[PDB]
Design a binder for this molecule. Structure first.
Ligand code: HEC
Ligand code: HEC
Ligand code: HEC
Ligand code: HEC
Ligand SMILES: [Ca+2]
Ligand SMILES: [Ca+2]
Ligand code: NA
Ligand code: NA
Ligand code: NA
Ligand code: NA
Lengths: 338, 131, 376, 376, 125, 343
């Protein structure tokens, strides 16, 4: 009944450019189902919508760590709040206000039909109820199996349906023994039922600014992206420069990488972690540029306790980690790996 | 008691060397010096490095990855010593090797061995070692 | 019945079946209480040593502290900290010596002070609890020096600094009674009262001689600082009691822990910490057995319990193991602790019935000293 | 019949009756010879450890050397010095780490060099003899580093100075063949030849891959520097022999220490130093027993002796004890050394008949590593 | 064997805890780690301090003063451990007391205990 | 031979004819009433103190031992091999008998008819007409007399106590125990280990314990402010600089009655001699002050070659142990000198 219908309404909204400022783009433009709900073509990189429905609502846990939420800086509590933010966000749909959204919904007879069947007669004449309903529908759609199918090779191997290759097995073993599992595993110990390779925490791993993206954003050379501290209501200076730990599902097909898209290749993202561990001169150099990585955009609150592990990944281990992370690709996106 | 016999796991006493999660432990069980099965005793430093074994749990018949961690910065505890080596490989396959003092990442650069914890981190097995 | 290892297995198995997560981390020890008990292992003069922190109620190790060569442990009676004076060398047991005091938080066990003692001034001796001692306020630690002559070092724990060495007469051990005063036992068979300042010759006064030169007072007397009661057995189980509570020594009637028939049949105290005193019960406990006169550091298998005021024997317990040291918790229905150096095990008994309740084994190489806090 | 302590009683008593005087003093150990044997006690990961210097012919401890945490011993083949790389910390097992090499005179046992290694570069691991190695001329000590990556440090024993770290590939162990060249074993199954200059990244050349990913080479191969012979058993007792004497690796025909029938009945090598090699006899000795495939570090009760040329079995000895490590002296009529970690005892055997001749007990807490000089 | 029985000296084996000269030894017998009855092992430092006991020699029925000395500067040997206390008095009579580490005077300020030697310095009186 | 030879030495010992101007005998400076030392030096020209002849006959002849330690001999610097050589040196020594040459000694011996008889009966007719033979015979005689029981009776209270005849007082007994456990045993016991048959409380070695110059004695000697007494290095034929400032360890028998103390008589009181050793071990300011002067002990005359391994023992003698050592060293007084302990 209403479960299916609510998601189906969200599926219609998700592909409708009428939800954008000048009817130019839909949520699908930037979060394209053909590219794991990222952009196949603002200063932050567009993250995947796949598995986003597994993230808990934003909260502060009992040890004082913040966890959960949506956006790179956690400023939406959950997917319904995110959708409302997205509809009015200048770097997403950019509608000027909630009434403009309701007016677009009212223009379309199928939306009068679909929204009234689910939320009651006259819903679209009330801009607050209209907007809230649209965000509710968009969130329900993203919570469907299609966005989180758990059908990767990794999934199949964990179900005992097939085996890792030797190289994929080595990479899994490195991932679970090296520092990656401190942040890109859901739990501290035990076995997750629906692992998405993120503990949903906020960390500053000390990335440099992406110059060319920063220039194209029009934010200004004097802009600094403070991550979680930019969430309204967070004032704790220890959160400055921290970003949500991304799920690594589909990582092999969603480049470029990190909050600002600074590295184009998955191998580079992995090599970045050697800057904290390796003594070799090459560990200081971004291979995509031949220059030093660059100083951290925010030179405080770095997760040095996890990052300064004492162990360098040799090239064999980096090859193994690439192979393992490619097994986290949903079945439908396997063709993209060639 | 026959040291050369195939090791037989149990799931009824974590302080004994035949407890199933200790299949590749080398050192001393932390629960015997004021830690617990998966936590370090006071005053010690929890390493971030780890070694892994796929250990069969006879209770549920599942094989779990135990990613051992050392608690570092104190002299060896001397309580509950154990060495098991299920699927343990030589040093040149270090992710499976247990003579190494896996204290890397411990706070304060602590590198001396005090005891080892046995937390589960996955349900999986290895090509070189499966039930 | 169910052991601690078995209960922990049952719990981890339930957590696993339930999918319960927990973060691997550094545990805190439980809060210090009257049933916490510390066992120090001098490890038969090894260059490094260990202290075990134990919950005596559960019979469980709750923590450890590493130490150097023959360190002296102290424990604040109010539970607020522990500390030791210790010695290390730059190449294991050779090279430059450093002596130092560490103070530890009693829950995290992290050192909160590390105070170097200039000129390597500690007395290296098989461990005697009252050769390093806290003042009643806990602000000062006093330690004994033998070379080049008897002397006492003053360490300010509040300011985290060494203060000074005091010159004393030819005397031994240190029983503090106030922020600036302690007593010692002198070769001449007196006690010495030493009252000191930040600078200046300390004021030293002696009691009269209280034992002759052929009556030998053991190296491990019991001292209750809160009662001011010094309980000092001789080799035959004669027990001196001195009341320092008024700030001057008053002497109590001497009692015999053994009967004349027992002593005629060879019963004598023997071991290491041969005597304990329970302050609220005003009771003395003494390790005794049948032995030759010169086997006074051997283990003993019995403990006699007597009323300190009358000397009456209240019990004689068969401990059922070779016991070198005893002590008691200072709460109402105390535990009697019985540590075997040879078994490296602490046996924990009901002090009223003598019954062995539980034990903690694997306590180092040659564990010898038990310390408890008197929190009440 | 007469033991060492009985002989010494008789001599002392004769000196007393004759009025012979003698000056109490520090003895010198007897000159190093073919039958001197060193036993290192890693003491199951204790922060301080010991090495025992033993006359194998008399079965007598003739000296000791103190060590820090998991030190690596080496013995010059010509008997001219011994050395180790060791690790200490400022507060027993915590605080600032110092790694260093000491070189000792082999008769006074005094350190003649103490060379700090910067940046605490040692690999801390249960002791593997070939994780620290002397060049054939004695002038250079090479040690392995694992963190942050496989690396080898160069220590100039002549100049008494650490030199530099060499970056290597993902390889393990150090088999020196020249003043400037050593071999390692690589994860990929190859050996790497590493030739190192004064400055320069080294020149590194790999051999062919010589074993598959599923054949496991133990952490304790035997290596005769004088023969250039690397003897490398796998978990099943297949033995790889690599001839390094031309300065490059020549793979000798593989040999099986156990028969097919024995392997089907569960025989496998197991222990710590599982393999020994006698250079003059060109003979291989291997600790074996019936065991499950994953009990490869438990003691074994048998040694098989085989001809390194033919693989022909020469002998199969019932050792009589739970043995963890073996080695041999390098003289003619060698001794076969059989160390038990559990008994803390070195059993000394006739290598030819395998009969137990004598034993030396009380060798610390968990002795594991035997080293001999090849002086011939 | 019975630890509490009167100690019974012998004059036939110096490595045993009942050897007559060891009547007030506390620690380890130096002959068991490369020293001898009256000399220190290589690498250790001979203390100049001593403690004394009168020990009965069952070979000749005489009691001799044994002025024990420690060999210092190494960790305790762990071989042939013994503790005997014939005539041993508490710490305030130090010349007969044997829990003290009598390493005073040793070369290089060595103060760690390795083992003890048992030389005679007189006939008792 | 033996009785007669010592009897001839007994006569010579008291004969002032053996001195330069016939003014003194051996017994003048080595007075049998004061344990063969000089009353005039007591509370009663070189700057060395006159040592006792008692127990000197137990000293081995001078020799280098296999460890390179010199041992034995006579005089404070060891320059005579044994008593006979010492006697011949004494006869010619400007600070002892001071005869100018051997002929002069033979001439005095010839003036006496009892000597012609006594010497001829032991050494042969014409002995006194050959100055070399006369002088050698006189030295031999003197040495034989010093080897008699009278000089070395072993009848001190210590000797009586070791024989089971008496016990020490508790203070003398603590003194003996301190002596045998503290550093004194390393130099003032005959043997390194085992038991001596005739203990004289010296190992006969040569040590520099770092004494200062005795300024008044040195002033009086006329030797000069720049003189240095090099001890054993002044023995002819010793050339090793490591021997500078070393003197023979004295026997402590009769020590309580043979003050003042040390090779130059610098300390009047036995207690001061014992207190001197605390300058190497005590931290107290008083340890470096000589209690007889109230001033610092003084720079050693010879800074080098001090026996610091034995002297820096790490342990200070408290006053109780100093008292006990004085009591014990008084037990080493021969019976016939016990009345001397009073004063
Ligand atoms: C113009 C491209 C663009 C369009 C159109 C767009 N988004 Fe986004 N989206 C982004 C970018 C860029 C971010 C990251 C912004 C940040 O972290 O501040 C983002 C973040 C998200 C996230 C956060 C996921 C995470 O892991 O943090 C969700 C959910 C999301 N968008 C859903 C939507 C929905 C639903 C629509 C249509 C209503 C939409 N987006 C339209 C670019 C777009
Ligand atoms: C201290 C936590 C932490 C550790 C350890 C860590 N990561 Fe990350 N990882 C992050 C965070 C946070 C981000 C996003 C950082 C940003 O964009 O600001 C990230 C981003 C990534 C990305 C890019 C994903 C994307 O969608 O852009 C990859 C790939 C990655 N990590 C892999 C690894 C691997 C492989 C390891 C072990 C070598 C590792 N990480 C260790 C926290 C961690
Ligand atoms: C004028 C005083 C005097 C006279 C007379 C005298 N001596 Fe001496 N004697 C000394 C002095 C002073 C010394 C120390 C000289 C030195 O060590 O160089 C000494 C040393 C000795 C010693 C060495 C003892 C030792 O322990 O070192 C002997 C032996 C000795 N004298 C015997 C004799 C004999 C025999 C005679 C008679 C032939 C004699 N003396 C005459 C003053 C005298
Ligand atoms: C290192 C060897 C050494 C040690 C140790 C030593 N002494 Fe001496 N002692 C000497 C020597 C040498 C002399 C003569 C010094 C000199 O006059 O130059 C001496 C002289 C003396 C004298 C003066 C005797 C005389 O006839 O003038 C007394 C008294 C004395 N020692 C007592 C002791 C006592 C008591 C101890 C222990 C506290 C002791 N000594 C420790 C070597 C030693
Ligand atoms: Ca991306
Ligand atoms: Ca004199
Ligand atoms: Na860019
Ligand atoms: Na904010
Ligand atoms: Na004078
Ligand atoms: Na000379």
């Amino acid at each position: 009944p209403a479960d299916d219908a609510l998601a189906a309404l969200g599926a219609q909204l998700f592909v409708d450019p009428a939800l954008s400022r000048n009817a130019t783009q839909s949520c699908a433009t930037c979060h394209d189902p053909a590219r794991a709900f990222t952009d196949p073509r603002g200063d932050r990189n567009t993250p995947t919508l796949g598995y986003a429905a597994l993230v808990p609502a934003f909260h502060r846990d009992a040890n004082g760590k913040y966890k959960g939420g949506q956006f790179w800086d956690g400023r939406a509590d959950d997917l319904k709040q995110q959708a409302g933010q997205s509809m009015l966000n200048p770097v997403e749909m950019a509608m000027p206000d909630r009434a403009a959204v309701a007016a677009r919904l009212r223009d379309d007879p199928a939306y009068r039909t679909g929204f009234e069947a689910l939320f009651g007669k006259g819903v679209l004449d009330d801009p607050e109820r209209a907007f809230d309903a649209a965000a509710e529908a968009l969130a329900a759609y993203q919570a469907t199996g299609e966005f989180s199918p758990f059908d990767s090779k990794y999934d199949r191997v964990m179900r005992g349906e097939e085996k890792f290759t030797p190289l994929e097995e080595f990479g899994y073993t490195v991932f679970i023994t090296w520092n990656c599992r401190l942040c890109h595993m859901q739990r501290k110990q035990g076995v997750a039922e629906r692992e998405t390779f993120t503990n949903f925490e906020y960390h500053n791993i000390g990335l440099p600014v992406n110059e060319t993206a920063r220039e194209a954003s029009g934010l200004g050379a004097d802009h600094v992206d403070h991550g979680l501290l930019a969430r309204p209501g967070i004032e704790d200076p220890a959160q400055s420069g921290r970003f949500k730990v991304p799920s690594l599902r589909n990582v092999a097909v969603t480049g470029p990488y990190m909050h600002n898209g600074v590295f184009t290749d998955l191998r580079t993202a992995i090599l970045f972690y050697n800057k904290y561990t390796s003594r070799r001169p090459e560990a200081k150099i971004n291979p995509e540029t031949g220059a030093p990585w660059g100083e951290p955009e925010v030179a405080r609150n770095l997760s040095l306790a996890e990052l300064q592990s004492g162990l360098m990944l040799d090239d064999g281990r980096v090859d193994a980690l690439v192979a393992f992370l490619e097994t986290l690709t949903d079945r439908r996106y396997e063709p993209l790996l060639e | 008691t026959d040291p050369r016999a195939k090791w037989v796991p149990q799931d009824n006493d974590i302080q004994a060397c035949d407890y199933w999660r200790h299949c590749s432990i080398d050192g001393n069980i932390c629960d015997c010096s004021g830690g617990s099965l998966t936590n370090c005793p006071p005053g010690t430093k929890l390493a971030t490095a780890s070694w892994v074994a796929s250990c069969y749990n006879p209770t549920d018949g599942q094989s779990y990855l135990i990613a051992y961690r050392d608690c570092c910065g104190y002299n060896v505890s001397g309580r509950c010593p154990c060495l098991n080596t299920e699927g343990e490989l030589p040093v040149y396959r270090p992710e499976f090797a247990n003579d190494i003092i896996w204290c890397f990442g411990a706070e304060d650069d602590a590198m001396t061995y005090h005891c080892t914890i046995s937390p589960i981190v996955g349900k999986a097995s290895h090509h070189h070692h499966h039930h | 019945q169910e052991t601690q290892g078995q209960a922990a297995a049952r719990a981890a198995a339930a957590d696993l079946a339930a999918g319960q997560d927990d973060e691997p981390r550094i545990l805190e020890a439980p809060a210090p209480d009257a049933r916490r008990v510390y066992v120090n292992d001098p490890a038969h003069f090894a260059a490094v040593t260990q202290q075990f922190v134990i919950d005596g109620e559960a019979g469980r190790v709750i923590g450890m502290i590493d130490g150097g060569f023959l360190p002296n442990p102290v424990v604040a009676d109010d539970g607020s900290f522990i500390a030791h004076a210790s010695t290390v060398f730059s190449r294991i047991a050779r090279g430059e010596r450093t002596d130092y005091v560490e103070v530890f938080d009693p829950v995290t066990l992290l050192p909160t002070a590390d105070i170097e003692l200039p000129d390597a001034p500690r007395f290296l001796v098989g461990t005697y609890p009252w050769m390093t001692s806290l003042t009643p306020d806990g602000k000062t630690l006093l330690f004994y020096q033998f070379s080049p002559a008897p002397a006492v070092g003053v360490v300010d724990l509040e300011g985290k600094a060494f203060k000074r060495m005091l010159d004393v007469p030819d005397c031994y051990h240190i029983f503090p009674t106030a922020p600036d005063t302690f007593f010692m036992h002198c070769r001449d068979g007196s006690l010495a009262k030493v009252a000191f300042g930040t600078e200046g010759t300390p004021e030293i006064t002696h009691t009269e001689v209280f034992h002759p030169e052929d009556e030998f007072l053991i190296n491990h007397p019991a001292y209750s600082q809160k009662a001011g009661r010094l309980v000092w057995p001789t080799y035959t189980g004669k027990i001196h009691q001195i009341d320092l509570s008024s700030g001057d020594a008053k002497f109590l009637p001497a009692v015999e822990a053994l009967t004349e028939a027992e002593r005629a049949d060879g019963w004598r105290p023997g071991g290491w910490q041969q005597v304990a005193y329970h302050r609220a019960l005003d009771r003395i406990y003494l390790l005794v057995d049948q032995r030759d006169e010169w086997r006074h550091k051997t283990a003993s298998r019995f403990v006699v319990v007597l009323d300190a005021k009358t000397g009456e024997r209240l019990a004689k317990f068969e401990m059922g193991h070779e016991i070198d040291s005893i002590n008691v918790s200072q709460d109402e229905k105390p535990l009697l602790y019985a540590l075997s150096t040879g078994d490296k095990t602490l046996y924990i008994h009901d002090a009223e019935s003598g019954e062995e309740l539980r034990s903690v084994n694997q306590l180092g190489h040659g564990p010898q000293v038990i310390t408890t806090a008197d929190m009440g």
